[PDB]
Write a protein that binds this ligand. Structure first.
Ligand SMILES: C[As](C)(=O)[O-]
Ligand SMILES: C[As](C)(=O)[O-]
Lengths: 195, 193
Protein backbone atom coordinates (compact mmCIF):
# COMPACT_ATOMS: atom_id res chain seq x y z
CA UNK A 1 0.00 0.00 0.00
CA UNK A 2 1.16 3.48 0.97
CA UNK A 3 4.85 3.99 1.60
CA UNK A 4 6.27 5.89 4.56
CA UNK A 5 6.53 9.67 4.16
CA UNK A 6 10.11 10.55 3.17
CA UNK A 7 12.66 13.13 4.29
CA UNK A 8 10.80 14.22 7.45
CA UNK A 9 12.09 17.66 8.45
CA UNK A 10 11.40 19.93 11.43
CA UNK A 11 12.43 23.39 12.63
CA UNK A 12 11.35 25.79 15.39
CA UNK A 13 9.04 28.40 13.85
CA UNK A 14 7.75 31.28 15.89
CA UNK A 15 6.58 31.14 19.49
CA UNK A 16 5.87 27.77 21.09
CA UNK A 17 5.70 25.93 17.77
CA UNK A 18 7.40 23.75 15.21
CA UNK A 19 7.07 23.57 11.43
CA UNK A 20 7.18 19.88 10.47
CA UNK A 21 7.27 18.93 6.77
CA UNK A 22 7.93 15.83 4.65
CA UNK A 23 7.77 14.35 1.13
CA UNK A 24 4.50 12.67 0.07
CA UNK A 25 4.84 8.87 -0.16
CA UNK A 26 4.55 6.82 -3.34
CA UNK A 27 0.93 6.15 -4.20
CA UNK A 28 -2.20 8.14 -3.39
CA UNK A 29 -2.27 9.47 0.18
CA UNK A 30 -5.54 11.10 1.23
CA UNK A 31 -3.96 12.74 4.27
CA UNK A 32 -1.41 12.37 7.04
CA UNK A 33 -1.36 11.63 10.76
CA UNK A 34 1.35 13.23 12.88
CA UNK A 35 2.42 11.92 16.27
CA UNK A 36 4.60 14.13 18.45
CA UNK A 37 5.71 14.17 22.07
CA UNK A 38 8.12 15.79 24.52
CA UNK A 39 11.50 14.06 24.31
CA UNK A 40 11.68 11.51 27.11
CA UNK A 41 7.92 11.03 27.35
CA UNK A 42 6.28 7.70 26.59
CA UNK A 43 4.41 7.70 23.28
CA UNK A 44 1.53 7.16 25.71
CA UNK A 45 1.81 10.91 26.25
CA UNK A 46 2.00 11.63 22.52
CA UNK A 47 -0.34 14.01 20.70
CA UNK A 48 -2.13 13.23 17.44
CA UNK A 49 -2.74 15.72 14.62
CA UNK A 50 -4.22 15.36 11.14
CA UNK A 51 -3.27 17.12 7.91
CA UNK A 52 -4.30 17.09 4.28
CA UNK A 53 -1.02 18.64 3.07
CA UNK A 54 2.64 17.43 3.40
CA UNK A 55 3.32 19.72 6.36
CA UNK A 56 1.83 20.90 9.64
CA UNK A 57 2.53 23.37 12.42
CA UNK A 58 2.74 21.85 15.90
CA UNK A 59 1.35 24.42 18.33
CA UNK A 60 0.74 25.08 22.03
CA UNK A 61 4.12 23.54 22.87
CA UNK A 62 6.32 24.38 25.86
CA UNK A 63 9.12 26.89 25.27
CA UNK A 64 12.77 25.73 25.11
CA UNK A 65 11.57 22.12 25.05
CA UNK A 66 12.75 19.14 22.99
CA UNK A 67 10.21 17.35 20.81
CA UNK A 68 10.16 14.14 18.79
CA UNK A 69 7.77 13.50 15.94
CA UNK A 70 6.93 11.19 13.06
CA UNK A 71 4.21 11.04 10.41
CA UNK A 72 2.39 8.35 8.43
CA UNK A 73 0.03 8.52 5.45
CA UNK A 74 -3.47 7.11 5.01
CA UNK A 75 -5.78 6.39 2.10
CA UNK A 76 -8.46 3.97 0.90
CA UNK A 77 -6.78 0.85 2.34
CA UNK A 78 -5.82 2.41 5.67
CA UNK A 79 -2.63 3.73 7.27
CA UNK A 80 0.83 3.12 5.86
CA UNK A 81 4.06 2.88 7.92
CA UNK A 82 5.40 5.80 9.97
CA UNK A 83 8.33 7.90 8.76
CA UNK A 84 11.59 7.94 10.69
CA UNK A 85 11.76 10.00 13.88
CA UNK A 86 12.97 13.62 13.89
CA UNK A 87 13.75 15.85 16.90
CA UNK A 88 13.49 19.60 17.36
CA UNK A 89 13.62 22.19 20.17
CA UNK A 90 11.28 25.16 20.59
CA UNK A 91 12.55 28.74 20.82
CA UNK A 92 13.10 30.37 24.20
CA UNK A 93 10.67 32.82 25.75
CA UNK A 94 11.46 35.47 28.40
CA UNK A 95 11.45 34.09 31.98
CA UNK A 96 8.60 34.67 34.43
CA UNK A 97 9.13 36.84 37.51
CA UNK A 98 11.86 35.86 39.98
CA UNK A 99 10.63 34.50 43.31
CA UNK A 100 9.22 36.81 45.99
CA UNK A 101 11.93 39.08 47.40
CA UNK A 102 13.43 38.31 50.82
CA UNK A 103 15.26 40.89 52.95
CA UNK A 104 17.78 40.54 55.76
CA UNK A 105 18.53 43.72 57.72
CA UNK A 106 22.28 44.10 58.20
CA UNK A 107 21.99 47.61 59.67
CA UNK A 108 19.92 50.79 59.37
CA UNK A 109 21.60 51.47 56.02
CA UNK A 110 22.38 47.99 54.65
CA UNK A 111 20.32 44.99 53.58
CA UNK A 112 20.75 41.64 51.85
CA UNK A 113 18.26 41.04 49.05
CA UNK A 114 17.66 37.48 47.88
CA UNK A 115 15.27 35.84 45.40
CA UNK A 116 14.48 32.42 43.95
CA UNK A 117 14.92 31.55 40.28
CA UNK A 118 11.74 32.29 38.26
CA UNK A 119 9.09 29.53 38.41
CA UNK A 120 9.36 29.40 34.61
CA UNK A 121 12.79 30.00 33.11
CA UNK A 122 11.57 29.28 29.56
CA UNK A 123 15.21 29.08 28.56
CA UNK A 124 18.67 29.46 30.04
CA UNK A 125 18.89 32.32 32.53
CA UNK A 126 22.15 34.21 32.14
CA UNK A 127 21.58 37.21 34.44
CA UNK A 128 19.34 39.27 36.74
CA UNK A 129 18.99 43.01 37.16
CA UNK A 130 18.25 44.59 40.53
CA UNK A 131 16.67 48.06 40.62
CA UNK A 132 15.73 50.19 43.64
CA UNK A 133 14.95 53.75 44.71
CA UNK A 134 13.08 55.93 47.23
CA UNK A 135 9.27 56.00 47.24
CA UNK A 136 6.81 58.30 49.04
CA UNK A 137 4.21 57.10 51.56
CA UNK A 138 1.98 56.02 48.67
CA UNK A 139 4.82 53.77 47.49
CA UNK A 140 5.44 56.04 44.50
CA UNK A 141 9.05 56.52 43.28
CA UNK A 142 10.30 60.00 44.21
CA UNK A 143 13.86 59.76 42.94
CA UNK A 144 16.10 58.08 40.30
CA UNK A 145 16.54 54.31 40.36
CA UNK A 146 19.81 52.55 41.11
CA UNK A 147 20.50 49.52 38.92
CA UNK A 148 22.82 46.58 39.43
CA UNK A 149 23.51 43.95 36.79
CA UNK A 150 24.06 40.48 38.27
CA UNK A 151 26.21 38.53 35.80
CA UNK A 152 26.34 35.24 37.70
CA UNK A 153 22.83 33.63 37.68
CA UNK A 154 23.70 31.42 40.66
CA UNK A 155 24.35 34.51 42.79
CA UNK A 156 20.75 35.19 43.77
CA UNK A 157 21.61 37.44 46.71
CA UNK A 158 22.86 41.01 46.72
CA UNK A 159 24.22 43.21 49.48
CA UNK A 160 22.94 46.78 49.15
CA UNK A 161 24.46 49.51 51.29
CA UNK A 162 24.41 53.29 51.67
CA UNK A 163 20.62 53.23 51.95
CA UNK A 164 19.01 56.30 53.55
CA UNK A 165 18.15 55.61 57.19
CA UNK A 166 14.50 54.98 57.94
CA UNK A 167 13.27 55.68 54.38
CA UNK A 168 11.09 53.31 52.30
CA UNK A 169 12.50 51.89 49.06
CA UNK A 170 10.98 50.04 46.12
CA UNK A 171 13.05 47.03 45.03
CA UNK A 172 12.63 44.99 41.83
CA UNK A 173 14.39 42.00 40.26
CA UNK A 174 13.98 40.86 36.65
CA UNK A 175 15.69 37.95 34.80
CA UNK A 176 17.24 37.46 31.38
CA UNK A 177 17.69 34.47 29.06
CA UNK A 178 18.10 33.97 25.31
CA UNK A 179 14.75 35.60 24.55
CA UNK A 180 15.49 38.70 26.64
CA UNK A 181 14.27 40.15 29.95
CA UNK A 182 11.10 39.05 31.71
CA UNK A 183 8.70 40.87 34.12
CA UNK A 184 9.86 42.21 37.51
CA UNK A 185 9.21 40.91 41.05
CA UNK A 186 8.60 43.84 43.42
CA UNK A 187 8.76 44.80 47.10
CA UNK A 188 8.41 48.00 49.15
CA UNK A 189 10.73 47.88 52.17
CA UNK A 190 11.80 50.27 54.95
CA UNK A 191 14.68 48.83 56.97
CA UNK A 192 13.47 50.70 60.06
CA UNK A 193 10.08 48.94 60.11
CA UNK A 194 11.38 45.46 59.29
CA UNK A 195 11.19 42.62 61.86
CA UNK B 1 6.70 64.39 34.30
CA UNK B 2 3.47 63.90 32.37
CA UNK B 3 1.50 60.74 31.63
CA UNK B 4 2.20 58.87 28.39
CA UNK B 5 -0.61 59.63 25.96
CA UNK B 6 -2.40 57.78 23.17
CA UNK B 7 -1.76 54.32 24.59
CA UNK B 8 -2.97 51.48 22.35
CA UNK B 9 -2.72 47.70 22.31
CA UNK B 10 -2.94 45.26 19.40
CA UNK B 11 -2.78 41.46 19.34
CA UNK B 12 0.53 40.65 17.64
CA UNK B 13 1.27 37.04 16.84
CA UNK B 14 0.72 34.09 19.15
CA UNK B 15 0.17 34.75 22.85
CA UNK B 16 1.42 38.32 22.36
CA UNK B 17 0.27 41.95 22.42
CA UNK B 18 2.07 45.00 21.01
CA UNK B 19 1.55 47.92 23.42
CA UNK B 20 2.78 51.39 22.50
CA UNK B 21 2.32 55.02 23.53
CA UNK B 22 3.67 58.54 23.03
CA UNK B 23 6.56 59.85 25.17
CA UNK B 24 5.22 62.16 27.89
CA UNK B 25 5.99 65.81 28.50
CA UNK B 26 9.37 66.20 30.17
CA UNK B 27 12.54 64.11 30.46
CA UNK B 28 11.53 60.41 30.69
CA UNK B 29 14.36 57.95 31.42
CA UNK B 30 12.17 54.92 30.84
CA UNK B 31 8.73 53.41 31.31
CA UNK B 32 7.01 50.96 33.61
CA UNK B 33 4.19 48.94 32.05
CA UNK B 34 1.58 47.25 34.21
CA UNK B 35 -0.73 44.61 32.72
CA UNK B 36 -3.18 41.96 33.89
CA UNK B 37 -5.91 39.56 32.78
CA UNK B 38 -9.12 41.59 32.65
CA UNK B 39 -11.32 40.97 35.67
CA UNK B 40 -8.38 40.16 37.93
CA UNK B 41 -7.02 42.34 40.72
CA UNK B 42 -4.19 44.68 39.73
CA UNK B 43 -2.63 42.79 42.62
CA UNK B 44 -2.27 40.10 39.95
CA UNK B 45 -0.61 42.54 37.55
CA UNK B 46 2.70 41.84 35.79
CA UNK B 47 5.39 44.53 35.63
CA UNK B 48 7.67 45.35 32.71
CA UNK B 49 10.25 48.09 32.28
CA UNK B 50 11.11 49.59 28.90
CA UNK B 51 13.50 52.23 27.59
CA UNK B 52 11.51 52.79 24.42
CA UNK B 53 7.86 53.95 24.05
CA UNK B 54 6.84 50.42 23.07
CA UNK B 55 6.85 46.87 24.40
CA UNK B 56 5.92 43.30 23.48
CA UNK B 57 3.82 41.51 26.09
CA UNK B 58 4.57 37.77 25.75
CA UNK B 59 3.70 34.43 27.39
CA UNK B 60 0.06 35.47 27.47
CA UNK B 61 -2.97 33.17 27.44
CA UNK B 62 -4.65 32.80 24.08
CA UNK B 63 -8.08 34.34 23.42
CA UNK B 64 -7.84 36.24 26.72
CA UNK B 65 -8.74 39.87 27.50
CA UNK B 66 -5.94 41.94 29.05
CA UNK B 67 -5.92 45.46 30.46
CA UNK B 68 -2.81 47.62 30.65
CA UNK B 69 -1.42 51.08 31.34
CA UNK B 70 2.00 52.73 31.34
CA UNK B 71 3.92 55.47 33.16
CA UNK B 72 7.26 57.19 32.66
CA UNK B 73 9.96 57.62 35.28
CA UNK B 74 12.63 60.28 35.59
CA UNK B 75 14.99 62.24 37.83
CA UNK B 76 12.09 63.03 40.15
CA UNK B 77 10.58 59.55 40.10
CA UNK B 78 7.44 58.19 38.44
CA UNK B 79 4.91 60.31 36.63
CA UNK B 80 1.17 59.50 36.57
CA UNK B 81 -0.09 56.48 34.63
CA UNK B 82 -1.66 56.64 31.19
CA UNK B 83 -5.34 55.89 30.62
CA UNK B 84 -6.29 52.21 30.58
CA UNK B 85 -6.35 50.15 27.37
CA UNK B 86 -7.76 46.66 26.75
CA UNK B 87 -6.86 44.07 24.12
CA UNK B 88 -7.61 40.40 23.51
CA UNK B 89 -5.03 37.86 22.41
CA UNK B 90 -5.56 35.78 19.26
CA UNK B 91 -6.95 32.25 19.43
CA UNK B 92 -4.84 29.07 19.20
CA UNK B 93 -6.23 25.65 18.20
CA UNK B 94 -7.92 23.80 21.11
CA UNK B 95 -6.26 20.99 23.03
CA UNK B 96 -7.77 17.53 22.50
CA UNK B 97 -11.31 16.67 23.67
CA UNK B 98 -11.70 14.78 26.94
CA UNK B 99 -11.11 11.01 27.01
CA UNK B 100 -13.77 9.29 24.91
CA UNK B 101 -16.61 7.63 26.84
CA UNK B 102 -18.62 4.72 25.47
CA UNK B 103 -21.89 3.27 26.70
CA UNK B 104 -22.47 0.09 24.70
CA UNK B 105 -26.08 -0.22 23.58
CA UNK B 106 -26.13 -3.23 21.30
CA UNK B 107 -23.61 -5.51 19.61
CA UNK B 108 -23.67 -3.06 16.71
CA UNK B 109 -24.54 0.21 18.46
CA UNK B 110 -22.86 2.50 20.97
CA UNK B 111 -23.25 5.99 22.38
CA UNK B 112 -20.10 8.11 22.21
CA UNK B 113 -19.39 11.19 24.33
CA UNK B 114 -16.53 13.50 25.25
CA UNK B 115 -15.87 16.55 27.41
CA UNK B 116 -14.85 19.94 26.04
CA UNK B 117 -11.08 20.39 25.54
CA UNK B 118 -9.20 21.36 28.74
CA UNK B 119 -7.79 24.32 26.83
CA UNK B 120 -10.34 25.70 24.38
CA UNK B 121 -7.94 28.54 23.52
CA UNK B 122 -10.85 30.20 21.76
CA UNK B 123 -14.54 29.68 21.01
CA UNK B 124 -15.18 26.12 19.87
CA UNK B 125 -17.67 26.01 17.00
CA UNK B 126 -17.51 22.33 16.03
CA UNK B 127 -16.17 18.81 16.53
CA UNK B 128 -15.44 16.03 14.05
CA UNK B 129 -15.89 12.34 14.90
CA UNK B 130 -14.00 9.76 12.85
CA UNK B 131 -14.11 5.97 13.10
CA UNK B 132 -13.21 2.84 11.19
CA UNK B 133 -12.05 -0.78 11.37
CA UNK B 134 -8.53 -1.60 12.59
CA UNK B 135 -6.47 -4.79 12.40
CA UNK B 136 -4.82 -6.72 15.22
CA UNK B 137 -2.15 -4.01 15.49
CA UNK B 138 -4.81 -1.30 15.88
CA UNK B 139 -3.95 -0.20 12.34
CA UNK B 140 -6.86 1.21 10.33
CA UNK B 141 -7.78 -1.40 7.71
CA UNK B 142 -10.29 0.29 5.44
CA UNK B 143 -12.30 3.51 4.94
CA UNK B 144 -12.81 6.13 7.66
CA UNK B 145 -16.35 7.31 8.48
CA UNK B 146 -16.73 10.99 9.41
CA UNK B 147 -19.51 12.84 11.25
CA UNK B 148 -19.32 16.62 11.54
CA UNK B 149 -20.80 18.10 14.70
CA UNK B 150 -21.82 21.72 14.08
CA UNK B 151 -23.31 22.43 17.51
CA UNK B 152 -20.40 22.46 20.01
CA UNK B 153 -22.91 21.89 22.83
CA UNK B 154 -23.91 18.44 21.53
CA UNK B 155 -20.95 16.39 22.73
CA UNK B 156 -22.62 13.00 22.47
CA UNK B 157 -23.22 10.94 19.33
CA UNK B 158 -25.11 7.70 18.69
CA UNK B 159 -23.22 5.35 16.36
CA UNK B 160 -25.04 2.49 14.62
CA UNK B 161 -24.48 -0.24 12.05
CA UNK B 162 -21.09 -1.22 13.48
CA UNK B 163 -19.87 -4.71 12.54
CA UNK B 164 -20.37 -7.25 15.30
CA UNK B 165 -17.28 -8.16 17.35
CA UNK B 166 -14.92 -5.99 15.28
CA UNK B 167 -12.49 -3.45 16.78
CA UNK B 168 -12.82 0.17 15.70
CA UNK B 169 -10.65 3.23 16.24
CA UNK B 170 -12.56 6.36 17.25
CA UNK B 171 -11.16 9.89 17.23
CA UNK B 172 -12.66 13.27 18.08
CA UNK B 173 -11.12 16.69 17.49
CA UNK B 174 -12.32 20.26 18.05
CA UNK B 175 -12.35 23.42 15.92
CA UNK B 176 -12.34 27.10 16.93
CA UNK B 177 -11.30 30.32 15.21
CA UNK B 178 -7.69 29.20 14.85
CA UNK B 179 -8.61 25.84 13.31
CA UNK B 180 -8.67 22.13 14.24
CA UNK B 181 -6.82 20.89 17.31
CA UNK B 182 -5.27 17.45 18.04
CA UNK B 183 -7.49 14.40 18.27
CA UNK B 184 -8.54 12.22 21.19
CA UNK B 185 -8.44 8.53 20.27
CA UNK B 186 -9.74 5.17 21.47
CA UNK B 187 -9.85 1.63 20.07
CA UNK B 188 -13.00 -0.24 21.16
CA UNK B 189 -14.64 -3.61 20.36
CA UNK B 190 -18.25 -3.68 21.56
CA UNK B 191 -18.05 -7.45 22.09
CA UNK B 192 -15.50 -6.94 24.86
CA UNK B 193 -16.15 -3.53 26.42
C1 LIG C 1 22.89 57.38 47.30
AS1 LIG C 1 21.50 58.70 47.74
C2 LIG C 1 21.03 59.39 45.93
O1 LIG C 1 20.11 57.96 48.56
O2 LIG C 1 22.29 60.15 48.50
C1 LIG D 1 -21.41 -0.15 7.07
AS1 LIG D 1 -20.09 -1.56 6.71
C2 LIG D 1 -18.98 -0.70 5.29
O1 LIG D 1 -19.13 -1.97 8.15
O2 LIG D 1 -20.90 -2.89 5.79
Amino acid sequence: DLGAPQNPNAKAAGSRKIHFNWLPPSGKPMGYRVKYWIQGDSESEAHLLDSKVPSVELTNLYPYCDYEMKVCAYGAQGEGPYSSLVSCRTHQEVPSEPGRLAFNVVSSTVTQLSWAEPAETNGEITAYEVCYGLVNDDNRPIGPMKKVLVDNPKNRMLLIENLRESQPYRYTVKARNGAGWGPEREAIINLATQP
